[PDB]
């Protein structure tokens, strides 16, 4: 029998063999091995309008990452740390083998340099992926870094997985109520560069219309069928289905095209739809080319592929008719069988395809222009490779991907270990924030084991941004041809063969109406006798290694449906399960014995047909058991790890099954923000913002996954003696009380690091150059005392006390009369200069980086949290003398109000307190993994009693101020706490007076811009509700954009008052009118002026200030 230890051994072997970022690495490796060559085979060869001149492409390859610096010669290999320090890009050159034919002359193969491709860390192309720990340490690398990102311009960028509906599949649904359309079907064909949507309607009058983007309006179904080669109506009604009931519905659509009985009539009907006012010939060729290119490109873009498109359309029409007759239900659209996850590999292959198309277009244009001008054939002289390197890099550094995607590439969140780990496993839904729909944010039952039910954001993105589960695995896909061949040789019969047997041979259709339809990637493949037998055969052949493991098969049987679905494409999220045969799992005692001593690994069990990865579609035929002790002969699979339904951050909560649901989501959100050690080499890498906890501690109450992910080596908190009591009222309403004496001993102290950088631009456009020197006499000088910290080279030296707006790096800029452009410390924050770095940015330009550190000591207003969703600020700090000591002299480190517990219902908090106290007393390990907690509470309480303390974890407490013994006992524990980066020292901002806008003459915006608070409409409404007129005037007029303007007494426009001698002058009346001054908001005067910019003429009518009577 499989106990807890054996299942944990299986899971630990899984985590040890393949890491936590296997999805990114697998997708990138697949793209690098296959998808790179496939793009240039798809290109094939470039043609030229000039006959006899063309190029044939060959192989493509990549080398080790390297750079080409000033005085370019041989390329020099670099390490990722050097790329980080020098603001380079960790990329490798790519070489392409090309052969030029000039009037059918071969010549010789040429291998050229076509650009640089970024390399993901720890991938197959990264030389540091197969290095020992000693060599990783030697080159300045963190041995525990799970590299799944890119170094672009020194920054670390990660490609977020994008979840979206499957493309080459038919989705059916009901039409909107009160409309002529009753049922709708949609397909989204994906080509090698473009995506085309085809929509099929079923109108009120029992007609079927097909309309896609290119051709305006709707086209009847029989018209498209005739245009694709189906001339006889019997051919159409037999390609749709063999059911007489379904065939009866085709009659209105069949007769609506009775006028058109030939392919050419349909073709020029489509031409008239697309081409207006042209002859028949060009119309028909335009129509046939648009049909062959923009109808269903995934099936093919060749004029002999029309039969496949016709059969696909017939199958889609059959599906919509089945929906109409009531034999189906509208598709879920949230079932994970209908969703695919695009990863870095697919995005990179699309981006590289686009960039290669642009590069080859430019190359052919330049080649033909040069040949028109007249020159010899030298490929290396006109490649202009810098296109490719520019196109890919700009995609990674901005996140604006091809196809309209935005935000795909994001900066890695290195706040701590958990932030980076959670970022490397995020999944973002594409169709989001356009409408709630109250159903895409639901917790679908298909997500079990694939997405974490807790780690989701709060707000507009709730339920749309998800995180992968522990054992989830994204499929990579194989080629459909081998699956099609094995399916055909298994015994299925093509639809054409079945139609022939039905029609040209006197065989009844009743025989084939009892057969099972067989699909492949959403496309109808054929007919089979018994679908269940075929599914069993495919499953058995897959487990024996004869068939690829990427193939998943399901069998669907209903009162009206009998189908077999086969999927072998990429983007499907699958999970592993142990195969159960006759009520006994295929993993036995010998297997776990061999697993516990390293003889076999997790991958060995998978390739032996004992553990299989199944997806959502196949799981419809599964009957899984949670534990080995409730297995039955009807069960098919067994869960490897019941606690593996959680994410990577929800796996750190102790006793998560005793808390309320929202608390775990809040815990995940806050744990993504705690302070602590984020990297071992943090002292040599340059990040814009960094935090460091001085004395981190690993939790006393652990979980099984804390040691696997390496959190015990990069902890982000400390253990605090927590008391649960009401004390002084300073911990009411989410606030907490902290010991000041323990703070003065350095409990939660931290350091904050900020970075400043500068570069000496060479300005090749005019040959002037920058220089980093002090600013004795310069145009934009600041002050003599400000530049007092700079050295003789114009750079401040380490270990000096900077303050306010002191100059760190001093450089001057040539006029575009030298101007002082020096980097100054940000206003309102000071520190000590920590590090100064000087290097060159691959072109001889001098790059200077200055890192400044400052010390953060906890105070009133700092934010702390737990692993159970208990955030709050410090209300007050109490010394050790004033704290309520117990009978042994132990004072609490943090006091927590009891009134916060009964409403939030976090029993795990008290359970963790008791467990931590037991762990500290006994010295024994405590495991708080959900559903498998050891030791139990009763054992821990008995051991606590045996060790000299009360079993209920309560203590006798005396008052530290008066010495009087409290009448009750107080609960003490060792709960683990975390400090968040929301410190009060970065949130204050006040403004009295200062700079104003140049346009509206109103106070500026921003903490660094001396401040300014916005007085919105709702505050004005509160002031009106109180009925305070003078307070409104003071808040809204006297303290912002007040001005005095002169208005003419006749026209009503604004005049002025010049200093020539003395005059009230009007723009139109000159000196023949009297002008009066009025105080007014300057924004109103701006509004008047910009209204006169348009043809509107606003005339102000004045009135007497003093009310007569």
């Amino acid at each position: 029998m499989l106990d807890t230890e054996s299942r944990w051994a299986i899971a630990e072997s899984f985590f040890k063999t393949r890491g936590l970022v296997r999805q990114h690495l697998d997708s990138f490796n697949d793209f690098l091995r296959n998808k790179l060559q496939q793009v240039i085979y798809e290109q094939g060869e470039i043609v030229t309008e000039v006959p006899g001149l063309k190029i044939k492409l060959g192989k493509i390859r990549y080398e080790k990452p390297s750079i080409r610096e000033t005085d370019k010669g041989p390329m020099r290999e670099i390490t990722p740390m050097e790329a980080r320090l020098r603001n380079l890009t960790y990329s490798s050159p790519i070489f392409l083998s090309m052969i030029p034919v000039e009037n059918n002359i071969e010549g010789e193969p040429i291998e050229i340099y076509i650009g640089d491709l970024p390399i993901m860390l720890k991938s197959v192309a990264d030389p540091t992926s197969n290095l020992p720990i000693d060599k990783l340490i030697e080159i300045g690398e963190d041995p525990k870094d799970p590299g799944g990102y890119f170094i672009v311009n020194g920054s670390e960028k990660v490609i977020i997985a994008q979840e979206d509906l499957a493309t080459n599949r038919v989705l059916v649904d009901y039409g909107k109520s009160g409309s002529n359309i009753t049922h709708v079907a949609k397909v989204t064909s994906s080509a090698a560069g473009y995506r085309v949507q085809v929509m099929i309607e079923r109108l009120k009058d029992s007609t079927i219309q097909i309309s896609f983007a290119t051709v305006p309006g709707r086209i009847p179904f029989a018209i498209i069928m005739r245009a694709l080669g189906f001339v006889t109506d019997r051919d159409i009604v037999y390609a749709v289905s063999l059911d007489p009931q379904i065939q009866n519905e085709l009659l209105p659509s069949l007769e609506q095209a009775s006028s058109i009985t030939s392919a050419e009539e349909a073709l020029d009907f489509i031409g008239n739809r697309v081409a207006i006012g042209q002859k028949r010939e060009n119309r028909i060729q335009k129509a046939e080319q648009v049909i062959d290119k923009y109808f269903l490109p995934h099936l093919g873009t060749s004029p002999e592929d029309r039969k496949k498109k016709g059969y696909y359309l017939a199958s889609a029409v059959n599906k919509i008719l089945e929906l109409y007759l009531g034999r189906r239900e509208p598709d879920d659209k949230d079932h994970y069988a209908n969703k695919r996850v695009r990863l870095a590999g697919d995005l990179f292959t699309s981006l590289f395809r686009v960039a290669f198309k642009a590069f080859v277009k430019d190359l052919v244009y330049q080649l033909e222009k040069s040949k028109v001008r007249g020159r010899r054939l030298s490929l290396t002289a006109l490649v202009r490779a810098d296109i490719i390197t520019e196109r890919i890099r700009h995609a990674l550094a901005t996140g604006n991907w091809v196809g309209g995607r935005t935000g795909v590439s994001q900066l890695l969140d290195r706040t701590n270990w958990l932030s980076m780990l959670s970022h490397l496993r995020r999944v973002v839904s594409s169709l989001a924030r356009g409408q709630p729909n109250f159903e895409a944010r639901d917790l679908h039952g298909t997500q079990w084991g694939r997405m974490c039910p807790f780690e989701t954001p709060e707000g507009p993105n709730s339920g749309l941004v998800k995180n992968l589960a522990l054992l989830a695995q994204v499929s990579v896909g194989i080629n459909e041809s081998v699956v099609e061949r094995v399916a055909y040789e298994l015994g299925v019969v093509s639809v054409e063969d079945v139609i022939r047997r039905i029609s040209e041979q006197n065989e009844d259709v009743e025989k084939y109406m009892s057969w099972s339809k067989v699909y492949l990637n959403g496309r109808l493949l054929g007919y089979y006798e018994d679908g269940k037998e075929l599914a069993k055969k495919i499953r058995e052949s897959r487990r024996q290694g004869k068939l690829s493991d990427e193939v998943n098969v399901a069998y669907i049987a209903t009162d009206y449906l009998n189908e077999v679905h086969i999927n072998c494409d990429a983007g499907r999220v699958r999970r592993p399960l142990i195969i159960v045969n006759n009520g006994t799992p295929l993993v036995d005692t010998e297997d776990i014995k061999k697993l516990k001593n390293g003889e076999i690994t997790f991958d060995d069990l998978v390739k032996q047909g004992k553990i299989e990865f199944i997806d959502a579609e196949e799981e419809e035929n599964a009957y899984v058991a949670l534990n080995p002790q409730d297995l039955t002969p009807d069960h098919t699979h067994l869960e490897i790890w019941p606690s593996a339904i959680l994410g990577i951050i929800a796996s750190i909560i102790p006793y998560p099954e005793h808390n309320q649901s929202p608390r775990n989501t809040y815990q995940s959100a806050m744990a993504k923000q705690s302070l602590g050690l984020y990297a071992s080499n943090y002292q040599i890498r340059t990040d814009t913002r960094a935090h460091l906890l001085h004395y981190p501690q690993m939790p006393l109450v652990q979980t099984r996954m804390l040691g696997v992910i390496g959190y015990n080596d990069r902890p982000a908190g400390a253990n605090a003696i927590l008391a649960i009591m009401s004390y002084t009222g300073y911990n009411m309403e989410d606030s907490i009380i902290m010991n000041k004496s323990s703070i003065e001993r350095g409990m939660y102290r931290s350091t904050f690091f900020r970075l400043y950088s500068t570069e000496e631009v060479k300005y090749p456009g005019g040959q002037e150059d920058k220089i980093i020197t002090p600013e004795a006499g310069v145009k934009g000088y600041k002050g003599k005392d400000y530049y007092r910290l700079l050295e003789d080279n114009g750079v401040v030296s380490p270990e000096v006390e900077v303050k306010g707006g002191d100059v760190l790096i001093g450089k001057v800029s040539p006029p575009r009369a030298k101007r002082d452009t020096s980097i100054v410390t940000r206003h309102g924050e000071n520190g000590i200069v920590d590090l100064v770095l000087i290097t060159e940015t691959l072109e001889g330009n001098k790059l200077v980086k200055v890192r400044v550190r400052d010390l953060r000591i906890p105070e009133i207003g700092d934010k702390f949290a737990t692993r159970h969703g208990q955030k709050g600020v410090v209300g007050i700090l109490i010394d050790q003398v004033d704290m309520p000591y117990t009978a042994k002299g132990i004072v609490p480190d943090i006091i927590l109000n009891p009134h916060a517990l009964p409403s939030r219902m976090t029993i795990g908090q008290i359970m963790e307190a008791i467990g931590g106290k037991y762990a500290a007393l006994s010295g024994k390990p405590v495991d708080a993994t959900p559903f498998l907690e050891t030791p139990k509470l009763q054992e821990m309480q008995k051991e606590i009693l045996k060790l000299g303390h009360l079993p209920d974890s309560t203590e006798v407490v005396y008052d530290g101020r008066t010495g009087q013994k409290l009448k009750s006992r107080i609960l003490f524990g060792i709960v683990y706490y975390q400090k968040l980066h929301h410190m009060v020292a970065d949130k204050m901002h006040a403004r009295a007076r200062g700079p104003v806008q140049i346009l509206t003459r109103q106070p500026t915006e921003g903490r660094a811009r001396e401040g300014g608070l916005r007085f919105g409409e709702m505050e004005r409404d509160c002031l009106i509700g109180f009925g305070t007129a003078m307070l409104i005037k003071d808040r809204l007029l006297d303290n912002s954009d007040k001005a005095v303007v002169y208005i003419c007494d006749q026209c009503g426009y604004v005049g002025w008052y010049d200093r020539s001698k003395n005059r009230y002058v009007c723009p139109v009346h000159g000196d023949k009118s009297v002008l009066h001054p009025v105080t007014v908001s300057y924004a109103f005067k701006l509004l008047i002026q910009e209204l006169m910019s348009m043809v509107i003429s606003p005339r102000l009518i004045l009135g007497e200030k003093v009310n007569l009577g």
Partner: protein, 47 residues
Amino acid sequence: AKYRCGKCWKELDDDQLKTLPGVRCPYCGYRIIYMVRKPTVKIVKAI
């Protein structure tokens, strides 16, 4: 002022006088250099 070669952390020391076409350690040819601690008594309060 005075610099220090970045290769192997605290490698060796060099000054302003090393005039080269680019920012480079004259001894090991490394492209990254740092700055020294400007030897001077610094007073920090042990609070």
